[PDB]
Coordinates of C-alpha atoms and ligand atoms in Angstrom, one line a residue:
Chain A
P23 CA -19.5 8.6 -18.8
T24 CA -17.0 7.2 -20.8
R25 CA -14.0 4.8 -20.1
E26 CA -11.9 7.7 -20.2
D27 CA -14.3 9.8 -18.2
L28 CA -13.9 7.0 -15.2
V29 CA -10.5 6.9 -15.5
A30 CA -9.7 10.2 -15.5
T31 CA -11.8 10.7 -12.3
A32 CA -10.0 8.2 -11.0
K33 CA -6.3 10.2 -12.1
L34 CA -7.7 13.3 -10.8
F35 CA -8.5 11.8 -7.1
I36 CA -4.8 10.5 -7.4
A37 CA -3.1 13.9 -8.2
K38 CA -5.0 16.0 -5.5
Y39 CA -4.2 12.9 -2.9
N40 CA -0.7 13.7 -3.3
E41 CA -0.9 17.3 -2.1
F42 CA -1.7 15.1 0.5
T43 CA -4.3 18.2 2.5
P44 CA -7.6 17.3 4.6
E45 CA -8.9 19.6 1.6
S46 CA -7.6 18.3 -1.7
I47 CA -7.5 14.3 -0.5
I48 CA -12.0 15.4 0.2
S49 CA -12.0 17.4 -3.4
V50 CA -13.3 14.7 -5.9
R51 CA -15.8 13.1 -3.3
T52 CA -19.0 13.1 -3.2
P53 CA -20.1 14.5 0.9
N54 CA -21.4 11.3 1.4
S55 CA -19.1 9.4 0.0
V56 CA -17.2 6.2 2.0
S57 CA -13.8 5.0 2.3
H58 CA -13.5 0.8 2.8
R59 CA -10.1 -0.6 3.8
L60 CA -10.1 -4.5 2.5
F61 CA -8.8 -7.5 4.6
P62 CA -10.5 -8.4 8.0
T63 CA -7.6 -7.2 10.1
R64 CA -7.6 -3.9 8.9
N65 CA -11.5 -3.2 7.9
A66 CA -12.2 0.5 8.6
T67 CA -14.9 2.8 7.3
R68 CA -14.6 6.4 7.0
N69 CA -16.7 8.9 5.8
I70 CA -16.1 12.5 4.6
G71 CA -15.1 14.0 8.0
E72 CA -13.1 10.7 9.2
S73 CA -11.0 10.4 6.0
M74 CA -10.2 14.5 6.8
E75 CA -9.4 13.6 10.2
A76 CA -7.3 10.5 9.8
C77 CA -5.6 12.9 6.7
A78 CA -4.3 15.6 9.8
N79 CA -3.4 12.4 11.7
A80 CA -1.1 11.4 9.4
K81 CA 0.8 14.6 8.2
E82 CA 1.9 14.2 12.1
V83 CA 4.2 10.9 11.0
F84 CA 5.0 11.6 6.9
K85 CA 6.8 13.7 6.0
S86 CA 5.7 12.8 2.4
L87 CA 3.7 10.7 0.5
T88 CA 3.0 10.2 -2.8
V89 CA 0.9 7.4 -5.0
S90 CA 1.2 6.5 -8.7
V91 CA -0.3 4.1 -11.0
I92 CA 2.4 1.8 -11.3
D93 CA 0.6 0.6 -15.3
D94 CA -1.7 2.1 -16.9
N95 CA -2.3 -1.9 -18.8
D96 CA -3.4 -3.2 -15.5
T97 CA -6.3 -0.6 -14.9
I98 CA -9.7 -2.1 -14.6
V99 CA -12.9 -0.1 -15.5
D100 CA -16.4 -0.7 -15.5
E101 CA -18.8 1.0 -17.6
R102 CA -21.5 -0.2 -16.1
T103 CA -21.1 -0.2 -12.2
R104 CA -19.1 3.1 -13.0
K105 CA -15.8 1.3 -11.1
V106 CA -12.3 2.0 -11.6
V107 CA -9.1 -0.3 -9.9
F108 CA -5.6 0.7 -10.1
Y109 CA -2.6 -1.0 -8.6
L110 CA -0.7 1.7 -7.0
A111 CA 2.7 2.2 -5.7
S112 CA 3.3 4.2 -2.6
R113 CA 6.2 5.9 -1.3
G114 CA 6.6 8.6 1.8
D115 CA 9.0 9.4 4.6
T116 CA 8.1 9.2 8.4
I117 CA 9.6 10.1 11.4
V118 CA 9.9 6.4 12.4
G119 CA 11.7 6.3 8.8
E120 CA 11.0 5.1 5.0
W121 CA 7.7 4.1 3.7
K122 CA 7.5 1.8 0.7
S123 CA 4.8 -0.7 -0.3
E124 CA 2.3 -0.7 -2.7
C125 CA -1.6 -0.9 -2.1
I126 CA -5.2 -1.7 -4.5
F127 CA -7.7 1.1 -5.0
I128 CA -11.0 0.8 -6.0
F129 CA -13.4 3.9 -7.2
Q130 CA -16.8 3.6 -7.7
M131 CA -17.8 7.3 -9.6
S132 CA -21.6 8.7 -9.4
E133 CA -23.5 8.6 -12.2
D134 CA -21.9 11.9 -14.1
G135 CA -18.4 10.3 -13.4
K136 CA -17.1 13.5 -12.5
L137 CA -16.6 12.4 -8.8
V138 CA -15.7 9.8 -6.5
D139 CA -18.8 7.8 -4.5
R140 CA -16.7 4.8 -2.4
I141 CA -13.1 4.1 -2.2
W142 CA -12.1 0.3 -1.6
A143 CA -8.8 0.3 -0.3
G144 CA -6.5 -2.5 -0.1
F145 CA -3.0 -2.5 1.8
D146 CA -0.2 -4.7 2.8
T147 CA -1.0 -5.6 5.8
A148 CA 2.1 -7.2 7.1
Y149 CA 3.4 -4.7 6.4
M150 CA 1.4 -2.3 7.8
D151 CA 1.1 -4.3 11.0
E152 CA 4.8 -3.5 11.1
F153 CA 5.0 0.3 10.1
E154 CA 2.6 0.0 13.5
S155 CA 5.4 -1.5 15.2
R156 CA 7.7 0.9 14.4
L157 CA 5.7 3.8 15.6
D158 CA 4.5 1.6 18.9
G159 CA 8.5 2.0 19.4
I160 CA 9.0 5.5 19.9
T161 CA 11.2 6.6 23.2
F162 CA 12.6 10.0 23.0
Chain B
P23 CA -17.2 -13.0 -24.8
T24 CA -20.4 -11.3 -23.2
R25 CA -20.0 -9.8 -19.6
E26 CA -22.0 -12.9 -18.8
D27 CA -19.5 -14.9 -20.4
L28 CA -16.4 -13.8 -18.4
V29 CA -18.1 -13.7 -14.9
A30 CA -19.6 -17.8 -16.0
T31 CA -16.0 -18.7 -16.5
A32 CA -14.6 -17.1 -13.6
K33 CA -17.3 -18.4 -11.0
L34 CA -16.2 -21.2 -12.9
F35 CA -12.4 -21.0 -11.8
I36 CA -13.9 -20.2 -8.2
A37 CA -15.7 -24.0 -8.3
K38 CA -12.7 -26.1 -9.6
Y39 CA -10.8 -23.6 -6.8
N40 CA -13.0 -25.2 -4.3
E41 CA -12.3 -28.4 -5.0
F42 CA -8.8 -27.9 -3.8
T43 CA -6.4 -30.3 -5.9
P44 CA -3.3 -29.8 -8.0
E45 CA -5.4 -30.8 -11.3
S46 CA -8.9 -28.7 -10.6
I47 CA -6.9 -25.3 -9.5
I48 CA -5.4 -25.5 -13.0
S49 CA -8.4 -27.3 -15.1
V50 CA -10.1 -23.7 -16.0
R51 CA -6.4 -22.2 -16.8
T52 CA -4.5 -22.0 -20.6
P53 CA -1.0 -23.5 -20.4
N54 CA 1.2 -20.4 -20.2
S55 CA -1.2 -18.8 -17.5
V56 CA 0.2 -17.4 -14.9
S57 CA -1.1 -16.3 -11.4
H58 CA 0.4 -12.9 -9.5
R59 CA 0.3 -13.0 -5.7
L60 CA -0.3 -8.7 -4.5
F61 CA 1.8 -6.8 -2.3
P62 CA 5.3 -6.8 -1.6
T63 CA 5.7 -8.8 1.6
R64 CA 3.9 -12.3 -0.5
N65 CA 4.5 -10.9 -4.1
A66 CA 5.1 -14.0 -6.1
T67 CA 4.1 -15.4 -9.9
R68 CA 3.4 -19.0 -10.7
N69 CA 3.2 -20.7 -14.2
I70 CA 1.2 -24.5 -14.0
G71 CA 3.9 -26.5 -13.2
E72 CA 4.6 -24.0 -10.0
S73 CA 0.5 -23.7 -9.3
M74 CA 0.3 -27.8 -8.9
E75 CA 3.3 -28.0 -6.6
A76 CA 2.0 -25.1 -4.0
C77 CA -1.5 -27.0 -4.0
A78 CA 0.0 -30.2 -3.4
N79 CA 2.3 -28.6 -0.4
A80 CA -1.4 -26.4 0.9
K81 CA -2.8 -29.8 1.1
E82 CA -0.8 -30.7 3.9
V83 CA -2.3 -28.4 6.1
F84 CA -5.5 -26.7 4.5
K85 CA -7.9 -30.1 4.7
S86 CA -10.6 -28.3 3.2
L87 CA -10.9 -24.6 1.7
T88 CA -14.3 -22.4 0.4
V89 CA -14.2 -19.4 -1.2
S90 CA -17.1 -17.7 -1.8
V91 CA -18.1 -14.9 -3.5
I92 CA -19.4 -11.8 -0.9
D93 CA -21.6 -10.4 -2.8
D94 CA -22.4 -10.7 -6.5
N95 CA -23.7 -6.4 -6.7
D96 CA -19.7 -6.4 -6.2
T97 CA -18.6 -7.4 -8.6
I98 CA -16.6 -5.6 -11.6
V99 CA -16.4 -6.7 -15.1
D100 CA -14.4 -5.3 -17.7
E101 CA -14.9 -6.5 -21.1
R102 CA -12.8 -4.3 -22.8
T103 CA -9.6 -5.9 -20.6
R104 CA -11.8 -9.5 -20.0
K105 CA -10.8 -8.8 -16.6
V106 CA -13.4 -9.8 -13.5
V107 CA -12.8 -8.9 -10.1
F108 CA -14.4 -11.1 -7.0
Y109 CA -14.3 -9.6 -3.5
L110 CA -13.6 -12.9 -2.2
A111 CA -14.5 -14.7 1.7
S112 CA -12.1 -17.6 2.6
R113 CA -12.7 -20.2 5.1
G114 CA -10.9 -23.2 5.7
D115 CA -10.0 -26.4 7.4
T116 CA -6.6 -26.7 8.2
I117 CA -4.2 -28.6 11.2
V118 CA -4.3 -25.7 13.3
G119 CA -7.9 -24.8 13.7
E120 CA -9.7 -22.2 11.5
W121 CA -8.4 -20.3 8.2
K122 CA -11.4 -17.3 7.9
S123 CA -10.1 -14.3 6.0
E124 CA -11.3 -12.1 2.6
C125 CA -8.8 -11.7 -0.4
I126 CA -9.3 -10.4 -3.7
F127 CA -9.1 -12.1 -7.1
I128 CA -8.7 -10.5 -10.5
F129 CA -8.7 -12.9 -13.6
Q130 CA -8.1 -11.8 -17.1
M131 CA -9.9 -14.2 -19.4
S132 CA -8.4 -15.9 -22.5
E133 CA -9.9 -14.0 -25.8
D134 CA -12.5 -17.0 -26.2
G135 CA -13.3 -16.1 -22.6
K136 CA -13.4 -19.8 -21.7
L137 CA -10.4 -20.0 -20.4
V138 CA -8.6 -17.6 -17.2
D139 CA -5.2 -16.5 -19.0
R140 CA -3.8 -14.7 -15.8
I141 CA -4.9 -14.1 -12.2
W142 CA -3.8 -11.5 -9.3
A143 CA -4.7 -12.2 -5.7
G144 CA -4.9 -10.1 -3.1
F145 CA -4.6 -11.6 0.7
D146 CA -4.1 -10.6 3.4
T147 CA -1.0 -10.7 4.5
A148 CA -0.9 -9.6 8.6
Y149 CA -3.4 -12.8 8.4
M150 CA -0.9 -15.1 6.8
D151 CA 1.6 -14.0 8.9
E152 CA -0.3 -14.9 11.9
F153 CA -1.8 -18.5 10.7
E154 CA 2.5 -19.4 9.9
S155 CA 2.6 -18.1 13.4
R156 CA -0.2 -20.6 14.2
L157 CA 2.3 -23.7 12.4
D158 CA 5.2 -22.8 14.2
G159 CA 3.4 -23.6 17.8
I160 CA 2.8 -27.7 16.9
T161 CA 4.1 -29.1 19.4
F162 CA 2.9 -32.6 20.6
Ligands
7MI201 C1 -5.0 -23.2 -3.9 C2 -4.2 -22.7 -3.6 C3 -4.1 -22.3 -2.3 C4 -3.7 -21.1 -2.1 C5 -3.4 -21.1 0.0 C6 -2.6 -21.8 0.8 C7 -5.1 -21.1 0.2 C8 -5.6 -20.5 1.3 C9 -5.1 -19.3 1.6 O1 -6.0 -18.4 1.2 C10 -3.4 -18.9 1.3 C11 -4.2 -17.5 1.5 C12 -2.9 -19.4 1.9 C13 -3.4 -19.3 0.1 C14 -2.2 -19.3 -1.0 O2 -1.0 -19.1 -0.4 C15 -2.0 -18.8 -2.6 O3 -0.9 -18.3 -2.5 C16 -2.5 -20.7 -3.0 C17 -0.7 -21.0 -2.2 C18 -2.9 -20.2 -4.3 C19 -1.7 -19.9 -5.2 O4 -1.0 -18.8 -4.8 O5 -1.8 -20.7 -6.3 C20 -3.2 -21.0 -6.7 C21 -2.8 -21.7 -8.3 C22 -3.8 -20.1 -6.9 O6 -5.0 -19.8 -6.7 O7 -3.4 -18.9 -7.7 C23 -4.8 -19.2 -8.8 C24 -3.7 -21.6 -5.9 O8 -4.4 -22.5 -6.3 C25 -2.9 -22.2 -4.5 C26 -2.6 -23.2 -4.7
CA202 CA1 0.1 0.5 18.1
CA203 CA1 7.5 -20.0 10.6

């Protein structure tokens, strides 16, 4: 797979991700793929089923959620390990208000480069905690 | 610069980084290089001058600092853009006890690949807030 092949699979992952359904967030992933969170305070590993359940839970809070690659100049491609690094803006609307953040996504593509075989996501964990505090504060 | 050229210059950056003096932390950098700290809650851009001053200040709290590549097999190298990505365990000895965390470092090498021309660092920002909380507790 070419450099352009690896990015294109990664862009496709993003496009389907932004549909924000359990179906779409798995449709560019190999069924054995895992999704790792970076940084000890938030480390977690999700197989496909756990990702679908995470997405469904997230839709109970987020009314919209879109990510986008801020700048293709910053994108990192390792043709030998079939890895792509994106730095993304995430924007969303939630029952506890606005979500606005940035994160770094790392993809390892399958041997044919057509699917995502592994994901590493690094979030602004302090922002995550703060968002979770808004959630913890629900009252009626 | 070969894939191995790029990695060696980044390993040397790491080595001088662990020496942790205002001089060592710039010895592997170009004179115009900038360091960016990722994520909105800790965004920052530092030229060589500000980096030395930040390191000197940080030496008032960190007595010793070791960043280590967790796994050479996870390293990402982009020969076309001259970028190396490390996922690193960080281990500090500080005036309020141990620092234990993880970070991702992105180096962009100079054209000849002997120096570091640009740096992005992604830290566990919730842990930074918790460490700064530990400092707020120094009490005598
Ligand atoms: C060596 C450091 C210290 C570094 C540090 C204080 C090290 C301990 C940490 O893990 C935390 C996350 C607290 C670090 C930062 O806050 C970094 O932000 C800091 C201050 C480094 C920095 O920002 O700039 C240097 C030059 C760097 O490594 O950028 C390449 C850089 O050299 C800095 C100044
Ligand atoms: Ca909670
Ligand atoms: Ca404080």
